[PDB]
Enzyme design. Structure first.
Site, PDB file in Angstrom:
ATOM      1  N   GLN B  69       0.843  -1.206   0.000  1.00  0.00           N
ATOM      2  CA  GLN B  69       0.000   0.000   0.000  1.00  0.00           C
ATOM      3  C   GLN B  69       0.879   1.259   0.000  1.00  0.00           C
ATOM      4  O   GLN B  69       1.722   1.402   0.885  1.00  0.00           O
ATOM      5  CB  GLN B  69      -0.880  -0.014   1.238  1.00  0.00           C
ATOM      6  CG  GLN B  69      -1.830   1.178   1.235  1.00  0.00           C
ATOM      7  CD  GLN B  69      -2.953   1.044   2.253  1.00  0.00           C
ATOM      8  OE1 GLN B  69      -2.798   0.419   3.307  1.00  0.00           O
ATOM      9  NE2 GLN B  69      -4.077   1.725   1.972  1.00  0.00           N
ATOM     10  N   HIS B  85      13.740  -2.155   0.932  1.00  0.00           N
ATOM     11  CA  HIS B  85      13.435  -2.392  -0.487  1.00  0.00           C
ATOM     12  C   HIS B  85      14.401  -3.404  -1.080  1.00  0.00           C
ATOM     13  O   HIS B  85      15.651  -3.209  -1.004  1.00  0.00           O
ATOM     14  CB  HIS B  85      13.606  -1.111  -1.262  1.00  0.00           C
ATOM     15  CG  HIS B  85      13.517  -1.239  -2.750  1.00  0.00           C
ATOM     16  ND1 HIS B  85      12.409  -1.752  -3.408  1.00  0.00           N
ATOM     17  CD2 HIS B  85      14.381  -0.837  -3.714  1.00  0.00           C
ATOM     18  CE1 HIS B  85      12.638  -1.711  -4.710  1.00  0.00           C
ATOM     19  NE2 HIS B  85      13.825  -1.174  -4.917  1.00  0.00           N
ATOM     20  N   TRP B  95       9.046  -2.302  -9.265  1.00  0.00           N
ATOM     21  CA  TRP B  95       8.527  -3.654  -9.217  1.00  0.00           C
ATOM     22  C   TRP B  95       9.604  -4.691  -9.570  1.00  0.00           C
ATOM     23  O   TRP B  95      10.302  -4.560 -10.552  1.00  0.00           O
ATOM     24  CB  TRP B  95       7.389  -3.705 -10.244  1.00  0.00           C
ATOM     25  CG  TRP B  95       6.386  -4.722  -9.987  1.00  0.00           C
ATOM     26  CD1 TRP B  95       6.249  -5.906 -10.651  1.00  0.00           C
ATOM     27  CD2 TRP B  95       5.379  -4.705  -8.965  1.00  0.00           C
ATOM     28  NE1 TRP B  95       5.188  -6.607 -10.126  1.00  0.00           N
ATOM     29  CE2 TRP B  95       4.640  -5.897  -9.092  1.00  0.00           C
ATOM     30  CE3 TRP B  95       5.021  -3.791  -7.968  1.00  0.00           C
ATOM     31  CZ2 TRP B  95       3.577  -6.222  -8.236  1.00  0.00           C
ATOM     32  CZ3 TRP B  95       3.960  -4.115  -7.111  1.00  0.00           C
ATOM     33  CH2 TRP B  95       3.250  -5.317  -7.259  1.00  0.00           C
ATOM     34  N   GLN B  98      15.092  -7.514  -9.366  1.00  0.00           N
ATOM     35  CA  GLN B  98      16.070  -8.492  -9.892  1.00  0.00           C
ATOM     36  C   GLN B  98      15.623  -8.986 -11.284  1.00  0.00           C
ATOM     37  O   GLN B  98      16.473  -9.366 -12.075  1.00  0.00           O
ATOM     38  CB  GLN B  98      16.271  -9.704  -8.970  1.00  0.00           C
ATOM     39  CG  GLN B  98      15.140 -10.752  -8.863  1.00  0.00           C
ATOM     40  CD  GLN B  98      13.955 -10.299  -8.062  1.00  0.00           C
ATOM     41  OE1 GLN B  98      14.009  -9.268  -7.358  1.00  0.00           O
ATOM     42  NE2 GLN B  98      12.852 -11.016  -8.203  1.00  0.00           N
TER      43      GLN B  98
HETATM   44  C1  LIG Z   1       3.546 -12.238  -7.461  1.00  0.00           C
HETATM   45  C2  LIG Z   1       4.734 -12.696  -8.270  1.00  0.00           C
HETATM   46  C3  LIG Z   1       5.990 -12.692  -7.694  1.00  0.00           C
HETATM   47  N1  LIG Z   1       7.082 -13.057  -8.397  1.00  0.00           N
HETATM   48  C4  LIG Z   1       8.443 -13.117  -7.850  1.00  0.00           C
HETATM   49  C5  LIG Z   1       9.288 -11.951  -8.312  1.00  0.00           C
HETATM   50  C6  LIG Z   1       9.177 -11.075  -7.079  1.00  0.00           C
HETATM   51  O1  LIG Z   1      10.327 -10.229  -6.962  1.00  0.00           O
HETATM   52  C7  LIG Z   1       9.094 -12.041  -5.898  1.00  0.00           C
HETATM   53  C8  LIG Z   1       8.396 -11.543  -4.648  1.00  0.00           C
HETATM   54  O2  LIG Z   1       7.133 -11.030  -5.002  1.00  0.00           O
HETATM   55  P1  LIG Z   1       6.269 -10.138  -3.988  1.00  0.00           P
HETATM   56  O3  LIG Z   1       4.961  -9.860  -4.620  1.00  0.00           O
HETATM   57  O4  LIG Z   1       6.392 -10.808  -2.643  1.00  0.00           O
HETATM   58  O5  LIG Z   1       7.043  -8.721  -3.942  1.00  0.00           O
HETATM   59  P2  LIG Z   1       8.023  -8.112  -2.819  1.00  0.00           P
HETATM   60  O6  LIG Z   1       9.358  -8.774  -2.838  1.00  0.00           O
HETATM   61  O7  LIG Z   1       7.299  -8.096  -1.491  1.00  0.00           O
HETATM   62  O8  LIG Z   1       8.353  -6.673  -3.472  1.00  0.00           O
HETATM   63  C9  LIG Z   1       7.381  -5.904  -4.158  1.00  0.00           C
HETATM   64  O9  LIG Z   1       6.605  -5.179  -3.197  1.00  0.00           O
HETATM   65  C10 LIG Z   1       7.362  -4.246  -2.405  1.00  0.00           C
HETATM   66  C11 LIG Z   1       6.282  -3.459  -1.665  1.00  0.00           C
HETATM   67  C12 LIG Z   1       8.184  -3.256  -3.231  1.00  0.00           C
HETATM   68  N2  LIG Z   1       9.110  -2.459  -2.390  1.00  0.00           N
HETATM   69  C13 LIG Z   1       9.053  -4.035  -4.210  1.00  0.00           C
HETATM   70  O10 LIG Z   1       9.941  -3.234  -5.028  1.00  0.00           O
HETATM   71  C14 LIG Z   1       8.149  -4.936  -5.068  1.00  0.00           C
HETATM   72  O11 LIG Z   1       8.982  -5.747  -5.907  1.00  0.00           O
HETATM   73  O12 LIG Z   1       8.339 -13.132  -6.421  1.00  0.00           O
HETATM   74  C15 LIG Z   1       6.867 -13.575  -9.672  1.00  0.00           C
HETATM   75  O13 LIG Z   1       7.912 -13.986 -10.350  1.00  0.00           O
HETATM   76  N3  LIG Z   1       5.672 -13.584 -10.263  1.00  0.00           N
HETATM   77  C16 LIG Z   1       4.594 -13.197  -9.544  1.00  0.00           C
HETATM   78  O14 LIG Z   1       3.394 -13.243 -10.158  1.00  0.00           O
HETATM   79  N1  LIG Z   2       5.257   7.004  -0.733  1.00  0.00           N
HETATM   80  C1  LIG Z   2       5.713   5.721  -0.804  1.00  0.00           C
HETATM   81  N2  LIG Z   2       6.856   5.406  -1.436  1.00  0.00           N
HETATM   82  C2  LIG Z   2       7.326   4.140  -1.537  1.00  0.00           C
HETATM   83  O1  LIG Z   2       8.416   3.890  -2.105  1.00  0.00           O
HETATM   84  C3  LIG Z   2       6.558   3.061  -0.893  1.00  0.00           C
HETATM   85  C4  LIG Z   2       5.334   3.470  -0.211  1.00  0.00           C
HETATM   86  N3  LIG Z   2       4.983   4.763  -0.242  1.00  0.00           N
HETATM   87  N4  LIG Z   2       4.596   2.552   0.439  1.00  0.00           N
HETATM   88  C5  LIG Z   2       4.986   1.165   0.507  1.00  0.00           C
HETATM   89  C6  LIG Z   2       5.698   0.799  -0.798  1.00  0.00           C
HETATM   90  C7  LIG Z   2       4.761   0.833  -2.026  1.00  0.00           C
HETATM   91  N5  LIG Z   2       5.468   0.286  -3.180  1.00  0.00           N
HETATM   92  C8  LIG Z   2       4.892   0.172  -4.409  1.00  0.00           C
HETATM   93  C9  LIG Z   2       5.681  -0.269  -5.465  1.00  0.00           C
HETATM   94  C10 LIG Z   2       5.155  -0.387  -6.748  1.00  0.00           C
HETATM   95  C11 LIG Z   2       3.825  -0.042  -6.987  1.00  0.00           C
HETATM   96  C12 LIG Z   2       3.268  -0.180  -8.410  1.00  0.00           C
HETATM   97  O2  LIG Z   2       3.883  -0.770  -9.324  1.00  0.00           O
HETATM   98  N6  LIG Z   2       2.059   0.339  -8.645  1.00  0.00           N
HETATM   99  C13 LIG Z   2       1.351   0.209  -9.918  1.00  0.00           C
HETATM  100  C14 LIG Z   2      -0.045  -0.412  -9.750  1.00  0.00           C
HETATM  101  C15 LIG Z   2       0.091  -1.802  -9.118  1.00  0.00           C
HETATM  102  C16 LIG Z   2      -1.089  -2.744  -9.256  1.00  0.00           C
HETATM  103  O3  LIG Z   2      -1.888  -2.578 -10.200  1.00  0.00           O
HETATM  104  O4  LIG Z   2      -1.197  -3.695  -8.437  1.00  0.00           O
HETATM  105  C17 LIG Z   2       1.268   1.558 -10.569  1.00  0.00           C
HETATM  106  O5  LIG Z   2       1.024   1.549 -11.800  1.00  0.00           O
HETATM  107  O6  LIG Z   2       1.458   2.593  -9.881  1.00  0.00           O
HETATM  108  C18 LIG Z   2       3.040   0.414  -5.920  1.00  0.00           C
HETATM  109  C19 LIG Z   2       3.564   0.521  -4.632  1.00  0.00           C
HETATM  110  N7  LIG Z   2       6.863   1.690  -0.931  1.00  0.00           N
HETATM  111  C20 LIG Z   2       8.045   1.273  -1.108  1.00  0.00           C
HETATM  112  O7  LIG Z   2       8.304   0.076  -1.168  1.00  0.00           O
HETATM  113 LI   LIG Z   3      10.101  -0.883  -3.032  1.00  0.00          LI
END
Ligand SMILES: Cc1cn([C@H]2C[C@H](O)[C@@H](COP(=O)(O)OP(=O)(O)O[C@H]3O[C@H](C)[C@@H](N)[C@H](O)[C@H]3O)O2)c(=O)[nH]c1=O
Ligand SMILES: Nc1nc(=O)c2c([nH]1)NC[C@@H](CNc1ccc(C(=O)N[C@@H](CCC(=O)O)C(=O)O)cc1)N2C=O
Ligand SMILES: [Li+]
Ligand SMILES: Cc1cn([C@H]2C[C@H](O)[C@@H](COP(=O)(O)OP(=O)(O)O)O2)c(=O)[nH]c1=O
Ligand SMILES: O=S(=O)(O)CCCN1CCN(CCO)CC1
Ligand SMILES: O=S(=O)(O)CCCN1CCN(CCO)CC1
Ligand SMILES: [Cl-]
Ligand SMILES: [Cl-]
Ligand SMILES: [Cl-]
Ligand SMILES: [K+]
Ligand code: NA
Ligand code: NA
Ligand code: NA
Ligand code: NA
Lengths: 234, 235
Positions: B69, B85, B95, B98
């Site tokens: 969120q 992060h 997003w 890696q």
């Molecule tokens: C859902 C999904 C995940 N993955 C892999 C690649 C991802 O890096 C890994 C972990 O996925 P995850 O959804 O737990 O993402 P998180 O590792 O929690 O990280 C994501 O959310 C955070 C709030 C942001 N700070 C990150 O930059 C964003 O990458 O799993 C896939 O390869 N395919 C997928 O459909």
């Molecule tokens: N102000 C702020 N900065 C940040 O860096 C940060 C927060 N908040 N809150 C927690 C988290 C949120 N990180 C993310 C990272 C990527 C998306 C993203 O790709 N958003 C898409 C829509 C995603 C969807 O459809 O599910 C977009 O197009 O904006 C959103 C939130 N985060 C730092 O980790």
């Molecule tokens: Li992030």
């Protein structure tokens, strides 16, 4: 030939051996052997080049499966010889047909044919195509080919036994792949250019259960093996 | 302020949540919630956008342990907020870093930073690189990223708690990838031309345990999912 045809089965392949064991149960007057380089445990071994006279005396038919080399001229002179090749002759004759057909788009399947002095070349008795899917690997097409081989051989066995067929040469010569052609495909040159489809076909063609077929060498000199996993949406 | 620091952790990731729980043994006045986007079993939820005023009032520090969120301006402007992060800022912010770094050769790693209005932007407290080997996939790199995250957090927790660090913004803006950029990369065009190396980088980037990420459509219109298995030769 008449009613008592004595059959020698030769194969080094595990699936064909199992098929042969089922044929022996049905036929009785049959021996099943592998070559000096087969790896089938406990299966009697026969060096065909050294046992020609003995084979010609004992047997009325020699039935090989997945044979890779020519028979002795005297064996061909002396006894009816038939081979079961897991390719669709005359396309991708020789080694591991489905590997090459995944890459080149030629038919694959199973061919029962008379043995002549060229590899996977003699007159065709029966054959059956196996369709290849965009998600297939070598391994997955091969499992289907082994099923096809079983069905085809069992269907035609009595006719093969009795010699009540008339075989026909293919209309064209086709092409032949050698062991060395397979080995040459294994190395992936990271600098080679092509389409993504071309590369995926290469990878899936070299994917066969857990065989470490495809490899590349990275910029530091380290070798890395590669296989792919493909799954159609359902 | 040591024990007097009242901390909120928001987390939507199983690994990051386990780390949060472990930190709770090191620091009593710490609450752990997931966002409404989280799917963690049994973890209480907090809608950050609805609860901004209460969060700012009640906490001294808010940590994003992979909270999905976005934190609104009123939250980030009203209390110190820090993100952990799993990317190496400022490269491949946003997003699945890696995935993008396997393809583009940019660094990846873990960054702990103060949060501002942009994604994965803001003053860096600490960070650490993760090397990417020729046999790595997204999944294998990510597993090492989670080990690095745990290392870096445990090392720096006191400074984070106390706000005793002197953080520095990266000198460049870098680049940002969003969820849509990953969705687009997923789809393989069979007519794309490139090197075998480039292709293998695409496939391994999209390989992550059994996620069905990469797909193509065949000549007949059937979708097919693809992942790669890479194994380096043992010495
Ligand atoms: C859902 C999904 C995940 N993955 C892999 C690649 C991802 O890096 C890994 C972990 O996925 P995850 O959804 O737990 O993402 P998180 O590792 O929690 O990280 C994501 O959310 C955070 C709030 C942001 N700070 C990150 O930059 C964003 O990458 O799993 C896939 O390869 N395919 C997928 O459909
Ligand atoms: N102000 C702020 N900065 C940040 O860096 C940060 C927060 N908040 N809150 C927690 C988290 C949120 N990180 C993310 C990272 C990527 C998306 C993203 O790709 N958003 C898409 C829509 C995603 C969807 O459809 O599910 C977009 O197009 O904006 C959103 C939130 N985060 C730092 O980790
Ligand atoms: Li992030
Ligand atoms: C020996 C070998 C086989 N294979 C696969 C491809 C072959 O079509 C399949 C069956 O192998 P094998 O039983 O050796 O061949 P055959 O069908 O000629 O009797 O196993 C590999 O992928 N790599 C290998 O090194
Ligand atoms: O990885 S290696 O190519 O060196 C060894 C291959 C071992 N496996 C080959 C395939 N069989 C299964 C039948 O294809 C299991 C053993
Ligand atoms: O095929 S799907 O992409 O729709 C779903 C795959 C679900 N798996 C994701 C990976 N986890 C392991 C953690 O990376 C197991 C379940
Ligand atoms: Cl396979
Ligand atoms: Cl090209
Ligand atoms: Cl993986
Ligand atoms: K002759
Ligand atoms: Na005889
Ligand atoms: Na307090
Ligand atoms: Na509550
Ligand atoms: Na406060």
């Amino acid at each position: 030939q008449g009613h008592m045809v004595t059959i020698l089965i030769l194969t080094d392949n595990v699936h064909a051996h199992a098929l042969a064991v089922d044929l022996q149960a049905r036929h009785g007057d049959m021996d099943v052997y592998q070559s000096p380089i087969g790896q089938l445990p406990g299966v009697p071994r026969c060096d065909v080049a050294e046992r020609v006279a003995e084979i010609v005396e004992r047997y009325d038919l020699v039935l090989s499966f997945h044979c890779k080399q020519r028979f002795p001229a005297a064996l061909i002179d002396g006894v009816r010889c038939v081979n079961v090749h897991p390719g669709f002759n005359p396309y991708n004759r020789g080694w591991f047909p489905q590997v090459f057909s995944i890459i080149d788009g030629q038919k694959v399947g199973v061919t029962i044919h008379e043995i002549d002095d060229q590899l996977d070349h003699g007159p065709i008795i029966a054959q059956r195509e196996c369709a290849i899917e965009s998600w297939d690997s070598s391994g997955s097409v091969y499992a289907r080919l082994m099923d096809i081989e079983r069905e085809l051989v069992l269907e035609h066995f009595d006719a093969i036994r009795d010699g009540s067929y008339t075989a026909k040469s293919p209309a064209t010569e086709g092409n032949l792949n050698l062991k060395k052609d397979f080995e040459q495909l294994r190395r992936l040159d990271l600098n080679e250019r092509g389409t993504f489809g071309h590369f995926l076909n290469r990878l899936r063609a070299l994917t066969h259960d857990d065989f470490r077929n495809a490899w590349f060498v990275d910029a530091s000199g380290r070798k890395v093996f590669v296989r792919v996993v493909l799954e159609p949406e359902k």
